[PDB]
Write a protein that binds this ligand. Structure first.
Ligand SMILES: [Cl-]
Ligand SMILES: [Cl-]
Ligand SMILES: [Mn+2]
Ligand SMILES: [Mn+2]
Lengths: 573, 576
């Protein structure tokens, strides 16, 4: 649980800062300069550059995004994403990892065999360096008019040590042997315009000099030219530090890589620290040529850099992204359908709430802005929709992405019951009970009082005093129960038999006018420990026919279940 | 609908880039330098500074966050959020806008009158500059031991023109008149230690020289000192450009503001370009002292900067954030209850999917990392949990925030949890789902089920339960005793134990045959109904057999009791 930090403030911590040291294990984590290496770059220039052109985009939604889904794309969902990317204006699209996945293989075959690839589109496929995998990759691409074969191997300090147990020379040979195999296979497949991409995977965890050495060595194998360049893609496989440091690394690589005119320098930033978009934008200013990402940031864990945010961040500062975002709702609908994951309410440009103002003051300012625009428009005999957007609080005209400005004018049962009472209510009980609270805001204490009054407290018509359980020694034997109960205050013996104690008690009640059928049942521990309490929840149809829930809490799994039956009976009556 | 860009490429566009001009109305938008001003800071130092200490945090969840909600927080939700922020270790908390909101006013009264404010916590309240609003703000804070009065007015080029139609002097007067009123009201309430914060609102749309002019003028009125500093909060009310430009602007303000030693320089980034976290981190390196934000990036439009991401971005690089995130799911659940908005599946540190690996090769690399750490710990006679985290693909030990690394396996309308429920009637507890997926990692529905049965259901060695006699006390709270006939590696033996029920009695009975079973959690649910009714039981236990391993067991039987006993046996045999 959360324990308030109580350790001494740092020596020299300002008097106006009363924060205390936490007990989080910070010593298990090192500054980036110590984990990897310090910054090699001198006289950086990216801080002085403002982006004034679109990068070359590559959309990796169909492979890198797809790999990240709990419900992977069906062939129909794949075609719909492919079609969306084509219609938006993307010209490089990663379509699979065909040597690793038969469904990827079959998808690549399908788009090639059906003639589904536009003339200005280059499909891209991922492969590891193993020769049999590169062969299978070329097989999948057979008959493509053009293709990027993207090969990679992990180069990071960490992976060399603990994953590959290999030295720098061995790891570089993995890459150059892979490059040689690609060159061999390309010569065997005529017609196709083969293009190559190499990634030193886990680049952000790799020494820059080494990443440069491996890239250069791979380039020497491929022998690219300005007309037929190679792509070096430098991923933040884990986003390990601040975007300025990533950008410094990009500028250094851009300045130091051999044969630079024949290189397309590509970025592939993940979002582990929340700064993928920033890494991409600063990295582009640092000299990169190309950015790989996904629509709305899909990709493993925190995702790939968001292509929508990057593109509209250009548009909103007067630079054409060369991609159509005129109908962001259509893009969002299609992405949600394809991925089966929602765009968050606050996602830049696309989110439900991003063009909303709930504040009277902000609303008024927005309207003053719109009015001044309309006055300037009327004066210049212009359509206001063609004038410079000048509106407080709205970075863009929502209409320019097909959206609108909105001047907009639950009891928490599950949360409160679990947090304050250690009860995880079955969903249908949550529903059953929250309705009561609606009628009966209700404070946390009031909610509990009502819960106890309905489920826990009642002892009429039925009260269970004590009982004797005669359980079967042998698996599948009969269990008997005799209980002392009160029925509207009148002490009564009941007795029944069944496959277990819960069944036995249910059957015993029938003799006394309660026809009870158990429809569902749940139980959970209420603390750690051998002798911990149990909470039981029983859903039952009760005649003297209403279906109701009951709740029981007790030291024994058995007794909690019996209490839950009594609770249900009393609720039915 | 969507029409493919079809305009010419740019002059100078490389032949290897076939992109075409879109029909997006880019002419309606200008570069930041033209919209606002050129920000040139040739001799900037922030690019060469690595953050080495936590900033002073201020959580604005109860104000900026609250105002951004579809459904504003009820009094109970406000209190729950306040308590969460205090418990995490926040010392400055913006509790509301009491001069503008009666519910905010009543909340501030509540927390003051009920003594909910710790002695190391300073509440902060937002106010506009109208003198009657400032008066109401001080009245809301009546009785507080200390409080920050945060007053603001909009200073942007655009707002001065179209909202106020005012000159620089007029707009500055709004602020200095507010500052004057604050000084007057503070003298009337000598029982409270008053502190001030001024924001030139829409700062990122304001000329830096003007922002400095207005802040300086407000500071001359307030007359702060190093012992009693003023906070100047510089908001990216709209995030207008890239975070390096924001950072340049902060370094410039930090160098140029008058009486800098009497200033706490505060950042308040919004996320309209998706770069708020970056703007905060570069801005802090630029010389800021303080950062305002919200847990999980709640707030106006795209949100305030995420305090959770900023905090754990320090932790994961060896800097103590001075805030406790050791149970991120508790923070998440509380936030979702208060805001009634979900934390997204991919949200840094807290999202559902952020400690998962779906890739086989990543899963293998993770296993190798974990193994190599364990080998190093054994060599050093150290707890692996105390050592340098060295695991590919996982920036932090998920356990350091209360979470668990999860290898996700695809089942060939799928997934392990879903198929187990649909095809076998079992609702696997989440931790069991994770454990079993790791077994599979080390698939077809049949393969999955066969693996599950072999792991949890089939083993009869070392332990097999033959029969048992359960003597349950009749009266509530009485002791249960058990005798059981068991086979231990095939040899039949009798065991005996007592506990608060049959499960506990059985667990205790096993201790005498060299199985130490320490029950951590337990779940049970119905399968089917009537005469065909069964119970599935799940027990999580720390098991030691004559090291300890945390394992799940599963038991299925017609009796709720027998199912639970089967689950204990299952766990023991899994541990072996
Ligand atoms: Cl039963
Ligand atoms: Cl029990
Ligand atoms: Mn990726
Ligand atoms: Mn704000």
């Amino acid at each position: 649980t959360i324990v308030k930090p109580a350790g001494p403030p740092r020596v020299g911590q300002p008097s106006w800062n009363p924060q205390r040291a936490s007990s989080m294990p910070v010593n298990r984590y090192r500054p980036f300069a110590e984990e990897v290496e310090p910054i090699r770059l001198r006289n950086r220039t990216w801080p002085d550059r403002v982006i004034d052109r679109a990068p070359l985009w590559c959309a990796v939604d169909l492979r890198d995004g797809n790999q990240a889904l709990i419900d992977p794309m069906s062939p129909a969902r794949k075609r719909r994403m492919f079609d969306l990317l084509v219609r938006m204006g993307y010209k490089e699209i990663e379509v699979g990892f065909p040597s690793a996945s038969q469904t990827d293989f079959d998808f690549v075959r399908e788009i090639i065999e059906q003639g589904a690839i536009p003339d200005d589109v280059t499909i891209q496929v991922l492969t590891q360096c193993r020769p049999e995998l590169i062969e299978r990759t070329f097989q999948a691409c057979s008959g493509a008019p053009r293709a990027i074969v993207h090969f990679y191997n992990s180069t990071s300090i960490l992976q060399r040590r603990v994953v590959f147990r290999a030295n720098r020379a061995e790891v570089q040979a993995i890459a150059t042997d892979g490059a040689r195999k690609c060159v061999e296979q390309a010569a065997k497949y005529p017609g196709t315009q083969w293009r190559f991409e190499y990634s030193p995977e886990s680049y952000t965890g790799t020494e820059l000099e080494y990443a440069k050495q491996v890239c250069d060595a791979v380039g020497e194998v491929i022998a690219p030219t300005p007309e037929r360049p190679i792509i070096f893609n430098l991923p933040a496989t884990v986003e390990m530090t601040t975007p300025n440091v990533y950008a410094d690394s990009i500028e250094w690589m851009s300045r130091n890589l051999a044969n630079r005119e024949s290189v397309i320098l590509s970025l592939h930033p993940h979002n582990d620290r929340g700064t993928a978009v920033a890494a991409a934008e600063l990295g582009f200013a640092a000299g990169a040529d190309r950015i790989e990402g996904c629509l709305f940031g899909n990709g493993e864990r925190t995702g790939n850099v968001c292509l929508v945010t990057l593109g509209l961040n250009l548009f909103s500062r007067g630079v054409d992204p060369q991609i159509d975002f005129s109908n962001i709702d259509e893009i969002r609908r299609t992405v949600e359908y394809c991925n089966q994951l929602p765009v968050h309410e606050r996602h830049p440009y696309g989110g439900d709430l991003v063009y909303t103002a709930f504040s009277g003051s902000h609303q008024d300012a927005i309207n003053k802005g719109l009015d001044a625009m309309k006055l300037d428009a009327d004066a210049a005999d212009c359509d206001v929709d063609d004038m410079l957007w000048q509106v407080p609080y709205l970075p863009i005209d929502p209409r320019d992405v097909g959206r609108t400005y909105e001047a907009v004018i639950k009891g928490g049962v599950a949360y409160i019951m679990k947090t304050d009472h250690g009860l995880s209510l079955p969903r249908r009980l949550q529903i059953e009970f929250s309705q009561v609270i609606q009628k009966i805001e209700v404070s946390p204490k009031e909610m509990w009082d009502a819960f106890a009054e309905e489920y826990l407290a009642p002892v009429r018509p039925l009260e269970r005093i004590r009982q004797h359980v005669d359980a079967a020694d042998d698996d599948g034997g009969t269990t008997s129960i005799t209980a002392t109960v009160k029925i509207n205050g009148v002490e009564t013996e009941i007795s029944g038999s069944g496959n277990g104690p819960l069944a036995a008690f249910v059957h015993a009640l029938a003799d006394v006018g309660f026809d009870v059928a158990v429809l569902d049942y749940y139980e959970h521990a209420m603390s750690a420990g051998d002798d911990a309490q149990a909470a039981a929840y029983v859903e039952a149809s009760v005649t003297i026919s209403k279906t109701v829930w009951g709740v029981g809490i007790a030291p024994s799994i058995t007794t909690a279940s019996l209490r839950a039956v009594v609770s249900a009976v009393n609720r039915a009556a």
